[PDB]
């Protein structure tokens, strides 16, 4: 064909404009092949473009951009495409246009993020024309109706304006809002940008005919801002939307933090009956009595297996093992069988066994606030301290006047054991609720240097000041740790310093680096646990980098184990992720490394019943080491919590394995201990409760996380294992009416009542099941759950959400 | 580590020299003698024989590697 552009390019040199424009046109026509020669002769085309007197600025820029595209520059090509003005076509959907649009998009997103952080400085020119191309693509995509894609590109660019415009002028605002909420909760990383998008979404929600104040308050909780939720609630009160307010308050109690709830409480305190009901609900009073009655009316517990265990029990080790397992079985139930029956068998245990027995009693009567200070009228120094500890567990996270009473007693404590127990109990009672007087009493007891009292002091300090990160107390604890010579107190301070600073996801680099470069192995462990508490559920790749590197390179096996367990805590919001790392680890040299891998898997799949996790646990159990098998057992039980055979076809295998090991000879005492705790786990709480770190709202549960961590910290002190009462999450749904009582109405599951029935105590099959307002509803066995065709009461909140639902009632 | 040690030592000697130059302590002709002995002992690299030998033997080292 033309075979050479030499003639045309040489002709373009001439001043004659008409000639110049026609040469430009023909060059644009034949650019695709002779881009090389055009490259050689760009200079003159650059002159032609830049000298704006010539009325072919756009064409010159377009041809130059195409040429530089063919070359591969892709940057000066981009600028020339930008300078082509509007002459560039966008709907031609050619390769060149498409790729230049891609380059525009990515470059613009880069400057967007750059400025995104930059407070005001830099404010790159963002060539308003580049803004023009991105906007044009926005409208083209809107025309094609790619609302998802418009929304996401807006998010990436940070263009909240375009995001809101597309979502509002989408095809279905509610579904779009749900999708955006999911993306914000999961994929978004930058805290500030995430909060901005949350605010925009909240405003969009408010801008609805019937604003979904559920989502509004959920996003507000993610945003902190108790004032906004308080004002919304007061406005709803004026609106008389009592049911809507009830549902919002229950969601708030389930998800938000005590500080947030208290702020909102005082803001509201700033008709009166409705206000009082809101206040009571937000405090959660009777919001636990509901669960209490729920378990009482559903306390399916096969105590025959525990009779088998107590026949198999010989050593005091397994004696306490079974005590703990029975406490787990019963969970928060007023009914106690062994304690009121096997009195002599209880007496057979003493020393650091009376303490754990009384603690088990507390766990069993969990939450029974009504007779507290009179229930303990039933039950030496060990039993006295255990009574204090059990009272604390009863008031676990519920800080009534029992905090003051425990403060008074611990002050009037004249024994190391009494001091330790009262310290534990008061720390539990005031967990999170950093109170200066309580912190002071703990500081005094801690300074009364003593291993017994010191461990409890450290734990209680961490609990009390949890997530509240007072640099004062931080330095105090670090100094006392570095100066006191009692490895026991040192462990207590390790857990305390990890706990104190639960929040502050990223605001931990200083202290974390200090601890991780510290001297003592116990303080390195403290640092790893502090990282866990800081980055709970964040999936922060930097945090995991640190944790795996240390867990693999450190010289102390204890801290290696702790670090892997921290990895486990961090990766829970992405269960599928953890298996790979925990596998490569679990198959380790260092048996503590293998144990840590097992426990990390347990944390990862707590309440989830993963299949691959059990696939990986089974080879571990039956390992040539004692504690490794113990951990394998406990992790498997944790995973299979509240699971059946059909849902997970290995629960039988592992239950039989537990039974065999307990009724075996040549396994180790601690192996039986692990098996007993595994049974207690699996069938904990009338087999009606589960363990999930994050609330049903996808919201991390601080009490659950702290409970699981402390429990995992039993290697060095058995009495701590009772903390799983905290993580015990009632697996129930309650339909509550405006009268604040259960209405005698039934729920229905459109599924086989064979895949989700209680385990068999030790019509072929329908696809329907029925239940009552107190409803054991497992996570997987919650989505399918539905209210029957018609009833007096209807679910004001979607039932597939789960949890506690308010029921709008018909005429009567 | 050896480089770090040498650097620290020469930092020390420089500090002492500064003290003497400021007159914070008396001149020690012996310590001087030693210092100018050191400097007198410093080598010459751009000697055009040293360099040829250096290249030659570096060539042998690289050959074996």
């Amino acid at each position: 064909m033309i075979t050479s552009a030499a003639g045309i390019i040489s002709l373009l040199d001439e001043d004659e404009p008409q000639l110049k424009e026609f040469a430009l046109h023909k060059l644009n026509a034949v650019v695709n092949d002779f881009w090389a020669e055009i490259s050689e002769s760009v200079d003159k085309i650059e002159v032609l473009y830049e000298d704006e007197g010539f009325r072919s600025r756009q064409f010159a820029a377009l041809v130059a951009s195409k040429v530089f595209y063919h070359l591969g520059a892709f940057e000066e090509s981009l600028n020339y495409a930008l300078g082509a003005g509007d002459l560039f076509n966008v709907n031609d959907n050619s390769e060149y246009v498409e790729t230049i649009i891609a380059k525009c998009i990515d470059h613009y997103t880069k400057q967007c993020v750059e400025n995104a952080d930059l407070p005001e400085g830099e404010k790159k020119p963002i060539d308003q024309r580049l803004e023009g191309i991105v906007n044009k693509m926005f409208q083209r995509c809107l025309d094609d109706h790619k609302y998802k894609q418009a929304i996401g590109i807006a998010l990436e660019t940070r263009r909240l304006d375009v995001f809101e415009k597309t979502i509002l002028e989408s095809n279905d605002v509610p579904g779009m809002l749900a999708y955006s909420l999911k993306l914000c909760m999961s994929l978004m990383q930058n805290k500030q940008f995430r909060n901005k998008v949350l605010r925009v979404l909240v405003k969009i929600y408010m801008n609805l005919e019937k604003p979904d104040f559920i989502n509004v308050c959920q996003c507000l909780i993610f945003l902190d801002d108790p004032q906004a939720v308080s004002d919304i609630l007061e406005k709803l009160v004026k609106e008389d939307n009592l049911l809507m307010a009830y549902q919002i308050c229950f969601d708030l109690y389930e998800s938000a933090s005590q500080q947030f709830l208290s702020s909102v409480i005082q803001n509201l305190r700033t008709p009166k009956d409705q206000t009082l009901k809101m206040i009571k609900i937000l405090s959660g009073e009777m919001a636990i009595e509901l669960h209490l009655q729920f378990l009482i009316r559903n306390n399916n517990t096969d105590l025959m297996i525990l009779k088998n265990t107590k026949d198999a029990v010989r050593n005091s080790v397994c004696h306490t093992a079974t005590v703990i397992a029975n406490s787990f079985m019963h969970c928060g139930t007023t009914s106690d069988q062994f304690l009121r029956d096997n009195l002599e068998w209880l007496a057979r245990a003493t020393n650091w066994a009376k303490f754990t027995a009384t603690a088990s009693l507390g766990v069993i009567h969990k939450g029974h606030e009504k007779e507290a200070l009179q229930l303990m009228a039933t039950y030496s120094a060990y039993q006295e301290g255990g009574g204090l500890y059990a009272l604390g567990l009863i008031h676990a996270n519920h800080g009534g006047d029992i905090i003051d009473y425990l403060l008074n007693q611990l002050k009037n404590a004249s024994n190391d054991i009494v001091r330790h127990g009262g310290s534990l109990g008061l720390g539990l009672a005031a967990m999170g609720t950093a109170r200066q007087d309580v912190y002071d009493l703990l500081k005094t007891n801690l300074y009364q240097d003593d291993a017994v009292t010191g461990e409890a002091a450290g734990l209680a300090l961490g609990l009390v000041m949890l997530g509240s990160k007072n640099a004062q107390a931080i330095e105090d604890m670090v100094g006392y740790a570095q100066e006191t010579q009692h490895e026991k107190i040192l462990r207590g301070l390790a857990v305390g310093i990890a706990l104190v600073m639960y929040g502050r996801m990223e605001e931990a680099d200083a202290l974390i680096e200090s601890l991780c470069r510290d001297k003592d192995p116990i303080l390195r462990r403290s640092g790893m646990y502090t990282v866990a508490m800081a980055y709970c559920g964040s999936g922060n790749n930097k945090a995991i980098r640190r944790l795996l590197h240390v867990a693999v390179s450190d010289v102390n096996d204890d801290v290696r184990r702790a670090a892997v367990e921290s990895l486990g805590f961090i990766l829970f919001r992405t269960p599928e992720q953890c298996p790979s790392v925990v596998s490569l680890l679990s198959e380790s040299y260092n048996p503590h490394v293998r144990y840590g891998a097992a426990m990390a898997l347990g944390i990862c799949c707590a309440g989830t019943g993963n299949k691959e996790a059990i696939n990986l646990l089974e080879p571990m159990t039956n390992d040539p080491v004692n504690y490794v098998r113990q951990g394998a057992l406990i992790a498997s039980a944790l995973i299979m919590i509240q699971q059946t055979e059909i849902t997970c076809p290995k629960v039988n295998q592992f239950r039989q394995l537990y039974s065999k090991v307990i009724n075996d000879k040549h396994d180790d005492v601690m192996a039986k201990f692990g098996a007993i705790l595994a049974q207690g786990i699996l069938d904990a709480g009338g087999h009606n409760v589960t363990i999930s770190l994050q609330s049903r709202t996808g919201h991390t549960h601080m009490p659950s996380v702290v409970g699981v961590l402390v429990f995992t910290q039993f290697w060095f002190w058995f009495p701590l294992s009772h903390f799983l009462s905290l993580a015990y999450t009632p697996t129930c749904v309650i339909g509550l009416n405006k009268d604040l009582k259960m209405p005698k109405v039934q729920y229905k599951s459109n599924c086989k009542p064979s895949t989700f029935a209680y385990p068999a105590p030790l019509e072929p099959e329908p696809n329907f099941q029925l239940l009552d307002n107190p409803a054991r509803v497992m996570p997987a066995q919650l989505k399918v759950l539905t209210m029957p065709e018609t009833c007096r009461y209807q679910p004001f909140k979607p039932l597939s959400i789960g949890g506690i639902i308010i029921l709008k009632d018909t005429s009567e | 580590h050896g480089l770090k040690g040498l650097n620290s030592k020469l930092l020390d000697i420089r500090s002492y020299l500064e003290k003497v130059a400021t007159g914070k302590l008396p001149i020690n002709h012996q310590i001087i003698y030693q210092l100018q002995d050191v400097f007198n002992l410093l080598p010459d690299v751009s000697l055009q024989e040293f360099v040829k030998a250096f290249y030659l033997k570096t060539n042998d080292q690289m050959v074996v590697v």
Partner: protein
């Protein structure tokens, strides 16, 4: 159109994931060995 651009992006990212994951597989073999 947009779908074309993001389809490309996914294509390159998936190529990278492929090669890096198989490298990870080799390293896992080494480590387990």
């Amino acid at each position: 159109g947009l779908r074309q651009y993001y389809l490309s992006k996914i294509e390159e990212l998936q190529l990278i994931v492929n090669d890096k994951s198989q490298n990870l597989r080799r390293l896992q073999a080494q480590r387990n060995e």
